[PDB]
């Protein structure tokens, strides 16, 4: 289907997909829901280009239309940047709703749940929407709710690690990304529909215009604004745009060889915390029925690769090949989430199921009863992942 594939090409801007025994505990991490754009850079650039053209009589008919809409968008986004949208809230109500309905026993009576979020409002509002749905279904829940910079160590590790911040900003992946954009993004066919003399434009300025335009269009379906630009581009053009953003995500935030696993290793404190909270619930030190955490794409992506969920930590030496093996939209769409579901069988042995975006995920260890894995084997495996992460990090101060 062309419709679903077009949405995929929004990559990490993709709206959460459609998703329409009982565990004793659920361990959760969840990106905020669908949001407004975080930066006005792409919009202003697209507008600076159009408006400068409207002066030198350089706009086509479709060009004139685009500019009017771009100006309007500029208005609608004003003061709204980075905020959670109505769609974002409904995504959370739906995730929480499906959990409640699927495991009513878990959240029945006076179950205790705890939730944390980062200081980022879109993350907090996400938690709120998620929590509000839960309480509505069972007003008798005990709920502990908190948030702030004090969770920076486990929810924003990507800001704390000096080496990573240097890598993300000025590291070796940049030139690679930039050469790949040049190869894959053919600007002129696209600019031809908005501008007279598309050929007069420099590849650099042309490439920027067109990237900014893809970015605007990519984010629009997340704003709950009844406007659409997905139509300005052909499927192939979206395919190409996406391949480039996909490569950026992979190299900047995941297991690309050029990153040396630095982007993945930084998530070890979060994995560590996940294991502790489950162990404490297993021992009975804690007695929560669920821990929920609300954070970002930058939290989810490396976390998932660090968990070793199959096809997320792959190390692809060749850039042009990443799109085949690693799909950002499958990992970190809007409202992306990981849930560990813990079960106890008839003989008291603990099993765990790993859901990524509410689909059962695979680990590179064996089980006689997929999708359930032995908690003991699993924890040993995660503990190895963590120890590897600590070494990786030790190689980079």
Numbering used by the authors: 19 to 38, 48 to 424
Question: What wording appears in the published article?
Answer:
We determined that prominent gut bacteria express homologs of the mammalian InsP6 phosphatase (MINPP) and characterized the enzyme from Bacteroides thetaiotaomicron (BtMinpp). The Vmax value for InsP6 (178 μmol/mg/min) is the highest yet reported for any member of the MINPP family, being several orders of magnitude greater than that for the human (0.006 μmol/mg/min) and avian (0.7 μmol/mg/min) representatives (Ali et al., 1995, Cho et al., 2006). BtMinpp folds into two domains, an α/β domain and an α domain. The active site in BtMinpp is lined with predominantly basic amino acids, thereby rationalizing how the enzyme can bind unusually highly phosphorylated substrates such as InsP6.
A second structure was solved by difference Fourier analysis at 2.42 Å resolution in which the inorganic phosphate ions are displaced by the nonhydrolysable InsP6 analog, myo-inositol hexakissulfate (InsS6), again bound in the active sites of both molecules (Rcryst 15.6%; Rfree 21.7%). Comparison of the structures of analog- and phosphate-bound forms revealed an rmsd of 0.20 Å for Cα atoms suggesting limited conformational changes occur between the two states. InsS6 is bound in the active site with its 3-sulfate group occupying the position taken by inorganic phosphate in the enzyme-phosphate complex and presumably that of the hydrolyzed phosphate group in substrates. This conclusion is consistent with the sulfur atom of this group lying 3.1 Å from the imidazole Nε2 atom of the side chain of H59. Indeed, in our crystal complex with InsS6 one of the E325 side-chain carboxyl oxygen atoms is only 3.3 Å from the ether oxygen bridging the 3-sulfate to the inositol ring, the analog to the phosphate-leaving group in InsP6. The structure of the InsS6-protein crystal complex rationalizes the ability of BtMinpp to remove the 3-phosphate from its natural substrate, InsP6. However, BtMinpp also removes alternative phosphates from InsP6, indicating that the enzyme’s active site can bind substrate in alternate orientations. In particular, the structure of the protein in complex with InsS6, a substrate analog, gave insight into the reaction mechanism. We propose that H59 acts as a nucleophile for cleavage of the 3-phosphate from InsP6, with E325 in an HAE tripeptide being the proton donor for the leaving group. There is 52% sequence identity between human MINPP1 and BtMinpp for those active site residues that have an atom within 8 Å of the InsS6 bound to the bacterial enzyme.
